[PDB]
Amino acid sequence: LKTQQEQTQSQLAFLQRKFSNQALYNWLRGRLAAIYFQFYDLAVARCLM
């Protein structure tokens, strides 16, 4: 059981040390969302043109 406990924790460590962690997606989302909204305003303006 202690062995399983350590294994569970090493997986938690993995989920933070791996590059593709929640921090990556949080960053990518925030950044892309800013781009997407800005792109949108421009796309609309041209549709209107």
Partner: protein, 48 residues
Amino acid sequence: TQFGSTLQNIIERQDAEALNALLQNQAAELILTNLSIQDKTIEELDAE
């Protein structure tokens, strides 16, 4: 942008593979512990 999304997929896969490797390694550790348990289980029956 295509190199970008391509790299992103590579990274996600690189990590997914590292995870499967981790999980199989762990499985071996538990099996070994379980073998020690089965050995004691037999000794118990021999004691009976």
